[PDB]
Amino acid sequence: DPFKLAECKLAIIHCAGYSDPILVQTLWQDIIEKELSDSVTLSSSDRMH
């Protein structure tokens, strides 16, 4: 959390067997909108890929 490693947060709670559906959906948004954020320098076909 202090570094916001969402791709590690999801692995921790999978390994720990703990599943709040709200946290899990929040982590998939944190992952999707970071991959959408940091890919902004690139064309739509490239960002789809």
Binding site: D1, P2, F3, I12, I13, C15, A16, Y18
Partner: peptide, 19 residues
Amino acid sequence: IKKLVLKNLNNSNLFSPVN
């Protein structure tokens, strides 16, 4: 340990020097 505990109420700030 395998048992997770959330405690957002007290964290060190990642994004800072130490005092």
